[PDB]
Amino acid sequence: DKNELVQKAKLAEQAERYDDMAACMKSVTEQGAELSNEERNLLSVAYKNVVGARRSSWRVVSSIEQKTEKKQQMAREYREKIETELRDICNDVLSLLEKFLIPNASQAESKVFYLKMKGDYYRYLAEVAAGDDKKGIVDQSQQAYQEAFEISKKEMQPTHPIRLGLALNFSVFYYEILNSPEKACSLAKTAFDEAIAELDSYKDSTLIMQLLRDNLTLWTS
Amino acid sequence: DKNELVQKAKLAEQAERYDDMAACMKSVTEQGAELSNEERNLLSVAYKNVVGARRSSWRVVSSIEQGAEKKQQMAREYREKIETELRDICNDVLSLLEKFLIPNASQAESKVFYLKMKGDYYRYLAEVAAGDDKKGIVDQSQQAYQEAFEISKKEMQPTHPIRLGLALNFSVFYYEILNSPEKACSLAKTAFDEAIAELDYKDSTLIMQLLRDNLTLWT
């Protein structure tokens, strides 16, 4: 039955039904065995589409709230509605990460990946948190990312797309959540340079490098 | 309040939250008042996006149904789940059309708009109908379009985008519900030529391009 749920998740992916895909991969995770690389990717794709839709939707409605008398009340009440969906999605992923995925992760690769994911989903809560819980949530995100960063420096090649992906996202955390363009720029630049140094069998790495450099070129002049 | 719900529907649209949008515009329709041009388009856009996602996923999953034994029972069962959502959506739209929209349309323009929608949603049921109900569901779609086509031809100019839009969809009905490359190309070509004939706004000329694209394809 673990195999059937995975096949159902793959159908949902083809069908572009992401709530279904998420539901299925949640159930796989809940059976408590370590996920394969394929199951890992299905889980992250599923929730990224689910969380992502709320994020974009939140941004658009936030933009309107600013530009809007008591019509801007309605935008605010809708924004709040979207936040509670967003927070529930993030709190689901975060529970899975603590109760199952991070403890069972037997390779550095899996650990960095799930800690990176933990960083990502606290970063999504932080984007949308009030000033009382914001700095506390920001902390959790920074810790998770930092732990992942240390493990991937000791254990993984600079060209490993999981290491580069962590670098990319951790840059973004620094730029968007904390307001440090140069701290973000450093992390991205070294990650990129370190990857160029190891060149002198994967194509996803060079794509992530291109994204790292795109963030540099944007964030400074 | 009608204006609250209409403004929510617009927020829902900008947010790409079409279930919310459709729900808001359903409530507006249920208040029994004739919708404005803005309101009928909000309703139409909302439901078209809601049903469209099911049509898309139905096609992908059906196409996977084309190998093994236990894998293809699961695709089948999932297809059935998608169909049951699809039909509930189509049946929401058709009830609104029957109980409120079609009977309150004070103008030929909006009459043709709603009879085209009726056509459209019965065509979507027909795409998903089995051997039995198909012929009856398929003919309800045809009557809806035919009545729309008749009102359209006497009351509206050939360049009017509702007339051209009806033609495009009625052509598509003939082509893929009834396997008539002839009756589809006929409808489309006349509508194009009759609209070309009366060039003596931006939506019209786009639907004209769509009509010809379908001719060009089906030759």
Partner: peptide, 19 residues
């Protein structure tokens, strides 16, 4: 060309407000 990704060439949802 009719495959699993084929869209029916009817009225699309065009001329609506982009941001």
């Amino acid at each position: 060309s009719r495959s699993g990704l084929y869209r029916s060439p009817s009225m699309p949802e065009n001329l609506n407000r982009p941001r």
